[PDB]
Design a protein around this nucleic acid. Structure first.
Ligand SMILES: [Zn+2]
Length: 252
DNA sequence: GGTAGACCAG
DNA sequence: TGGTCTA
């Protein structure tokens, strides 16, 4: 899921779990659990805690309990569902939180790529994976100035820069390619080569792209197809070890 | 600072 | 392929 999907999950999941008390935690793929390392300690500490809130940072979901926060990342195919303990689990269900009212929060993930960390609330923000996470793209903490500051200090491509989680939180491949197209910037441009005007434009399109999504595509996955703005076939190469889509005419 | 390790299965 | 951590 992308940041906008994660925000949707945050919004819709919360009322389904708030105020419920955890009675059991069942884990079928231990490797999902990253902290505490021992998945049995993970399970034991959450029992008896009540869900008090649900926040998002980047693509991370932060479940607030009584004493702890559960930090969860779905990666590409992780999904949460709330349902009855009386019904069979869906395929690829790896973690289940059982509540005292007979309902469950289920985590499914065909790729088994997602991660979970639990810490005392007051520690969550200064421990992995939230530590070092950059500002929310939709927040004033993410500004042209901040972006400019990071751009000049590096020799990497502009795409690599925007993919950097310390620069800005949860900006995925798709939104990077779309935003660069919209800003008229080639993804392979060295970040330091960007003018001040290009930085402001990029910031503006980044916010617009992610902002519109939280509420179609120009280039992502459209290789071999005409650009919607100029008709030139969209091209695909590899930049920053990633599938990279761009229009060689609109972007410079 | 930096990229190339690591995890997964359709 | 993807995202984010550790080495
Ligand atoms: Zn074009």
């Amino acid at each position: 899921p992308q940041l906008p999907e994660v925000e949707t999950i945050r919004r819709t999941l919360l009322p389904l779990i708030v105020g419920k008390t955890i009675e059991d935690v069942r884990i079928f793929w231990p490797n999902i659990i990253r902290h505490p390392r021992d998945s049995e300690a993970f399970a034991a500490r959450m029992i008896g805690q009540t869900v008090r809130g649900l926040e998002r940072r980047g693509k991370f979901l932060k479940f607030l309990l009584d004493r702890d926060a559960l930090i969860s990342h779905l990666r590409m195919e992780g999904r949460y569902a709330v349902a009855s303990a009386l019904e069979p689990l869906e395929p690829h269900t790896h973690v289940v939180f059982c509540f005292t009212d007979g309902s469950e929060l289920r985590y499914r993930d065909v790729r088994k790529f997602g991660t979970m960390h639990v810490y005392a609330k007051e520690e969550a923000d200064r421990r992995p994976p939230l530590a070092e996470l950059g500002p929310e793209p939709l927040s004033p903490a993410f500004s042209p100035a901040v972006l400019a500051e990071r751009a000049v200090k590096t020799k990497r491509s502009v795409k690599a820069l925007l993919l950097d989680c310390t620069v800005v939180a949860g900006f995925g491949n798709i939104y990077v390619d779309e935003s660069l197209f919209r800003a008229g910037i080639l993804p392979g441009r060295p970040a330091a080569s960007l003018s001040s005007k290009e930085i402001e434009r990029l910031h503006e399109e980044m916010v617009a792209t992610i902002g519109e999504a939280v509420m179609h595509l120009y280039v992502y996955g459209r290789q071999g197809n005409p650009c919607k703005r100029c008709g030139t076939p969209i091209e695909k190469t590899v930049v920053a070890g990633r599938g990279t889509h761009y229009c060689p005419r609109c972007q410079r």
